[PDB]
Design a protein around this ligand. Structure first.
Ligand code: HEM
Lengths: 416, 39, 46, 97, 122, 122
């Protein structure tokens, strides 16, 4: 349900009587993708400063996504309207709050987060993969900025960022839970007061096949990731890309089902225990995406074997995927979509992301209908178009001596 | 395979090109062109 | 040297084939080595 | 494992040709070895095709060589290879030393 | 191969005597500049023949920072040789940065080996 | 190689029919007696071709006591073939001790493999 208030801001809510808890949040787009190297991380810092305000009993948290930012005030159902007002206040006084703020403490917090994403091997690998894939464009920048750039941010920078991006045309109030939509809309309208402005032009980005290798021989595993130019939220292949990713699905060697998971790659890598774990994903940004896998290999001598087998299984995508695999992938993608949309916090984040970045959100039933329309031939056409023989972007962290340089993995993308 | 057949394309192309350029560069010297004078 | 004429014709064909193939090999090697000759490193210890 | 590693024969071929971890800074001089090997094939190959026509008797050795040059279809080519290829074998060996 | 013990013995034999020092040391710097390894980012001790148990021990007993710097310099030298290009004068290794960082560890390794050999023939 | 599942299918196909049972089973006992493996301490399941993934898994999933007994029987058979001698009739494996101990595990491995193959072609 949608209602465009005065100021032109849009309130989008997905109310469900069965919701355990309610959530309402203001999102104003312009994540890291809107920043540049010198002032990178300013969006995350501003959102953290706003989210650090008095919560009046609610749970105020920052979002800090790649392309959009926002503050979400989780709260029980009956309190939702209050939370509404809260965030409205927090955003009608955003410039005042930033001005009166001593950014020191918030900057050590953001630097701690930036170090965290540079220590968690998967976070580091995926951040490096995104940076190298879209190198040269703002989309390459970290969501939370780097430790070198965070410390160089000042209040005036955050004020300029808010003035540019915290405008009615670039902001959305998303909500979910069990409440009357009209009550929340009325409560926010009386309290929301933000500057006018045009929606900032979203910066361009183009995929560039590349390889980045942070080899740290002191780590205990090899955390690699390989991906191709995926499908953005706009592309009609979005769900098709998710189905293609789920065809290969996840795998954890020590999990009980490791010996029974359907995907062929799982059966292949367990013969010599090539890999410890992997997960296929289709990350989707506003207009471009990254479709691939992340993997952790325990045996440093089998990174090449895993890459070879995974890329061969990708080659299967354009030739030999059976109706069983396509049906399994469809069912698993539908279940994953429904799982991702259970928590009211997740529903609010999803509503904000879609409404800001594509303008319209497909209901879950519409998404199910769109996925069920996929046939095996559609998946193979997508594999031919986007996976078969397309440039790949690679990343690795530790014990990657066995990760053969680009040309080997790239040539694996087209050998039968 | 198609390697076997395709090799014929290039071999024949170069062979005919050279066997058509050679008897043009050397037409005044080859036998088949000089035999008329001595017959 | 009764093979003189045949020898030099075969030589012309061989030079054509091998020169085209050598140029192709030069191109292929430079192309497949572009990733290596374009590597850029960083060393950033504390 | 990949067929190029599981099979012992292909495992050897891989260890020597497909995955031999060569250093990244080797010049073209390091290619000479391959050429030498190539030449070893050529010397053998053409060689095996000369003994099919060469008669080792002292009263036939030179006449047999001339029979190769003049009578065998590509005999001139095989002899000129087997000889100039030996000269090139030693050129490449001196360069490799 | 000549041991760093003997190389340093000869070098200190020369350096102690002022005449030989004055004659050689300018020639030593000139030779080390014409050697051309500094233009590829390598310090002298990077050139040392690693493939010996003494030298392998010496590297295996380097500090962390020196080990990583050596790794990066060797990789840079490999890349420069690979791409047939040299570091500009401003980026090359200056004479004062060629600090003979690995010599002490090699000398300690050779001291240990020489004591072991001497005591085995006590 | 014949999958053990097929062997048991054929064996029960024969055993179920009283005429074929009465004919074969005497010949079955006579054939296993003339085979000569029992005089070397081997039970039937010791003879099975070990070098197969299914069989190797079956061996890997044997109980400890059965595994050690099998190891000793195989070692004894090797020693007997080495010394060119046979066990005395009182020490040879009696027909009652030839108990088909490994077949259940082999059949379980075959069942798992066949289920995996069937589902992979669902
Ligand atoms: C690295 C290995 C070899 C080298 C360097 C080599 C080199 C040579 C050279 C320089 C000649 C002189 C021929 C001439 O001057 O006309 C010759 C002759 C000959 N070689 Fe080889 N050769 C090699 C291996 C072989 C092998 C494996 C065979 C097997 C048949 C072979 C068969 C012959 C024969 C039959 C001749 C007689 C030459 C003739 O009749 O024209 N050679 N070899």
């Amino acid at each position: 349900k949608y209602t465009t208030l005065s100021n032109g801001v849009t309130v989008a809510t997905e109310t469900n009587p069965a919701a355990k808890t309610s959530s309402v949040g203001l999102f104003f787009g312009a994540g890291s993708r809107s920043e540049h190297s010198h002032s990178n991380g300013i969006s995350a810092l501003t959102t953290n400063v706003l989210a650090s305000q008095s919560a009046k009993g609610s749970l105020l948290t920052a979002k800090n996504d790649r392309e959009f930012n926002g503050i979400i005030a989780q709260t029980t159902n009956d309190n939702i309207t209050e939370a509404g007002k809260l965030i409205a206040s927090i955003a009608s006084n955003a410039v005042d709050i930033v001005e009166k703020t001593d950014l020191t403490k918030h900057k050590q917090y953001l630097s701690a987060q930036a170090s965290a994403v540079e220590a968690d091997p998967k976070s580091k690998v995926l951040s490096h993969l995104y940076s190298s894939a879209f190198q040269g464009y703002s989309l390459a920048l970290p969501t939370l900025g780097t430790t070198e750039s965070v410390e160089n941010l000042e209040n005036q920078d955050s004020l300029r960022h808010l003035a540019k991006h915290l405008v009615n045309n670039n902001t959305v109030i998303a909500a979910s839970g069990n409440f009357d939509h009209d009550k929340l809309a009325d409560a926010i309208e009386a309290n929301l007061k933000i500057a006018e402005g045009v929606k900032p032009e979203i910066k361009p980005a183009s995929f560039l096949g590349s390889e980045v290798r942070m080899r740290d021989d002191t780590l205990p595993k090899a955390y690699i990731s390989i991906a191709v130019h995926g499908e953005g939220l706009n592309s009609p292949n979005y769900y098709l890309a998710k189905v293609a990713a789920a065809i290969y699905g996840d795998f954890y060697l020590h999990s009980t089902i490791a010996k029974f998971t359907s995907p062929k790659l799982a059966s292949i890598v367990q013969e010599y225990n090539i890999v410890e774990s992997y997960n296929h994903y289709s990350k989707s940004f506003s207009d471009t995406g990254i479709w691939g896998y992340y993997a952790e290999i325990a045996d440093k001598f089998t990174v090449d074997d895993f890459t070879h087998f995974s890329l061969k299984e990708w080659n299967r995508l354009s030739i030999s995927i059976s109706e069983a695999e396509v049906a399994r992938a469809k069912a698993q993608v539908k279940t994953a979509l429904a799982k991702e949309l259970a928590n009211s916090f997740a529903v609010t984040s999803d509503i904000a992301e879609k409404v800001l970045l594509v303008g319209h959100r497909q209901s879950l039933r519409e998404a199910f209908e769109k996925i069920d329309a996929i046939k095996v031939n559609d998946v193979k056409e997508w594999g031919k178009s986007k996976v078969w023989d397309r440039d790949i972007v690679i990343s690795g962290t530790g014990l990657i001596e066995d990760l053969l340089d680009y040309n080997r993995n790239r040539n694996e993308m087209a050998m039968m | 395979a198609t390697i076997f057949g395709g090799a014929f394309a290039f071999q024949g192309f170069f062979d005919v090109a050279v066997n058509k350029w050679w008897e043009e560069h050397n037409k005044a010297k080859l036998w088949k062109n000089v035999k008329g004078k001595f017959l | 040297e009764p093979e003189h004429d045949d020898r030099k014709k075969w030589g012309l064909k061989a030079l054509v084939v091998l020169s085209s193939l050598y140029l192709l090999s030069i191109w292929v090697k430079r192309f497949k080595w572009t990733p290596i000759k374009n590597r850029k490193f960083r060393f950033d210890p504390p | 494992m990949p067929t190029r590693k599981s099979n012992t024969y292909l495992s050897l071929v891989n260890s020597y040709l497909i995955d031999s971890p060569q250093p990244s800074s080797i010049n073209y001089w390091w290619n000479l070895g391959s050429l030498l090997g190539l030449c070893l094939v050529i010397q053998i190959a053409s060689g095996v095709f000369l003994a099919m026509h060469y008669s080792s008797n002292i009263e036939l050795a030179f006449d047999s060589v001339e029979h190769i040059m003049r009578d065998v279809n590509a005999g001139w080519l095989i002899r000129y290879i087997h000889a100039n290829g030996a000269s090139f074998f030693f050129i490449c060996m001196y360069l490799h030393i | 191969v000549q041991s760093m013990t003997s190389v340093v013995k000869a070098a200190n034999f020369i350096l102690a005597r002022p005449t030989l020092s004055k004659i050689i040391t300018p020639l030593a710097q000139k030779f080390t500049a014409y050697a051309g390894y500094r233009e590829m980012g390598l310090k002298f001790n990077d050139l040392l023949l690693e493939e010996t148990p003494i030298m392998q021990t010496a590297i295996k007993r380097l500090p962390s920072e020196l080990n990583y710097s050596r790794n990066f310099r060797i990789l840079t030298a490999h890349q420069l040789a690979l791409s047939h290009q040299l570091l500009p004068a401003e980026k090359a290794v200056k004479p004062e940065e060629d600090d003979n960082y690995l010599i002490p560890y090699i000398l300690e390794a050779e001291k240990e080996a020489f004591e072991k050999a001497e005591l085995d023939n006590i």
